């Protein structure tokens, strides 16, 4: 008669590493490194993202003629740009504080596009029907952004215009605008007459005044002229006043939005399907259960610390030593 005390063993082949030994076969292990993803762009916390496709953020906000499908944008928890998002500022120029804007609009609760300064009778005694270019061509034809209006000299006189807007939308209002810069002071006059024009933008929190920066410069996608795009968030109850004697690319449509918390912009070509998630990446949705992730350094949400590891397997059972 005998009795032996011993330990378990099985067909397991999982191996873990220890301080003293590499690859030790164990009866039971658990993985702490999430390295799989659904290769899809999901909803972050139950709120679909915003797809721009061929358009990038600048093209979407300005109203590039190739982003007509984006004129209905609504809600979104994060923005998606594609390797094909090259349609932005069709008319050459610098988008002032662009990154900063991209960052601030990464997440939006409510977002409504309204006509702040109606093209139809808003700038009488001013030409508002020639503001079109070949750079921003829509279906072969010459066109222009859909949220800005290219006001140009009437007849042969460009009278000083003035227009204000008060935010009564009960929420921040994104007001975009631009200032055109002719290549020559010869054009500055054939377009805006006044060869000393200025564009001023006033608000209880704004005052930057502009003047045309004429300069011989290379032609970009056609035009040698340039357009700097500006923006500002108009607080509830505040009034933004525009007055200019030329070079003003007036706001036509503005957006009344509601920012709560900020997220970011994912750039990927993965399909956008209806799935949920707490942590999202460019390659797809990642699980938020494990303490570590090695799928992508760049993520958005509540994510598992990114590590350069390939294996973080933790033992639960004991050494596996079978054989009868």
């Amino acid at each position: 008669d005998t009795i032996c005390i011993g330990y378990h063993a099985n067909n397991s082949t999982d191996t873990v590493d220890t301080v003293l030994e590499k690859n030790v076969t164990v009866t039971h292990s658990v993985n702490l490194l999430e390295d799989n993803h659904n290769g899809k762009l999901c909803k972050l916390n139950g709120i679909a993202p915003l797809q721009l496709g061929k358009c990038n953020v600048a093209g979407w906000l300005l109203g590039n003629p190739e982003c007509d499908l984006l004129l209905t944008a609504n809600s979104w928890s994060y923005i998606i740009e594609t390797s094909n998002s090259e349609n932005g500022t069709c008319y050459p120029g610098e988008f002032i504080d662009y990154e900063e804007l991209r960052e601030q609009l990464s997440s939006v609760s409510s977002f409504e596009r309204f006509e702040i300064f109606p093209k139809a009778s808003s700038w009488p005694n001013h030409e508002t029907t020639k503001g079109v270019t070949a750079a921003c061509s829509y279906f072969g034809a010459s066109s222009f952004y859909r949220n800005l209006l290219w006001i140009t000299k009437k007849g042969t006189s460009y009278p000083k215009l003035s227009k204000s807007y008060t935010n009564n939308k009960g929420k921040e209002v994104l007001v975009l605008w631009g200032v055109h810069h002719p290549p020559t002071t010869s054009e500055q006059q054939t377009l805006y007459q006044n060869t000393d024009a200025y564009v001023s933008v006033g608000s209880s929190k704004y005052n930057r005044r502009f003047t045309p920066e004429i300069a011989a410069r290379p032609k970009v996608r056609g035009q040698a002229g340039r357009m700097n795009y500006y923006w500002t968030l108009l607080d509830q109850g505040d009034t933004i006043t525009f007055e200019a004697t030329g070079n003003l690319i007036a706001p036509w449509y503005a957006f009344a939005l509601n920012k709560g918390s900020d997220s970011g912009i994912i750039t990927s070509d993965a399909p956008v399907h209806n799935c949920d998630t707490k942590c999202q990446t460019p390659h797809g949705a990642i699980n938020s259960t494990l303490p570590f992730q090695n799928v992508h350094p760049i993520t958005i949400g509540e994510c598992p610390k990114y590590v350069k590891s390939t294996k973080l397997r933790m033992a639960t059972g004991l050494r596996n030593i079978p054989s009868i």
């Binding site: 008669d1 330990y7 997220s263 509540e302 610390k305 004991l318 050494r319 009868i324």
Partner: protein
């Protein structure tokens, strides 16, 4: 390992014991078989289970967007942001890596320790009523039917 039992004086695992991590295997005139020591097994599961939760549950994380976007005249801060990202990810990589290594050592030792304690719990009861065969077994100096085998299993072995 650290406590001598696994791959030690009890050099092999029991593919036949399929209802627990640590247990016995008796052999008497009536029959033979394995029996997992339920108390030391459950306790071991509870502990490991708790250890795994800790390593997971203790990881705090807030909503965050790692990416940044800086223009060609913001190389300095783009690099600063880079130092931060590489930086933390160099910390979590060294920590995860080592936390597992060290905790894996601890876990295996824990099992080894549980076996040695079990073996010893028994070696205590039998005393002289059995001879120790350095393979983790005890051969009784008397007959030990299933009641007897049972008593030692549930630590209530009579006069020793």
């Amino acid at each position: 390992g650290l406590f001598g039992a696994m791959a030690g004086f009890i050099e092999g695992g029991w593919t036949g014991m399929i209802d627990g991590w640590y247990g016995y295997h008796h052999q008497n005139e009536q029959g033979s078989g394995y029996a997992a020591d339920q108390k030391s097994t459950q306790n071991a599961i509870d502990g490991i289970t708790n250890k795994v939760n800790s390593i997971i549950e203790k990881m705090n994380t807030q909503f965050t967007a790692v990416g940044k976007e800086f223009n060609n005249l913001e190389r300095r801060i783009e690099n600063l942001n880079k130092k931060v990202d590489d930086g933390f990810l160099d910390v979590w990589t060294y920590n995860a890596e080592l936390l597992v290594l060290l905790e894996n050592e601890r876990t295996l030792d824990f099992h080894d320790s549980n076996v040695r304690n079990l073996y010893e719990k028994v070696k205590s009861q039998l005393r002289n009523n059995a001879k120790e065969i350095g393979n983790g077994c005890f051969e009784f100096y008397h007959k030990c039917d299933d009641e007897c085998m049972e008593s030692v299993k549930n630590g209530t072995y009579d006069y020793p």
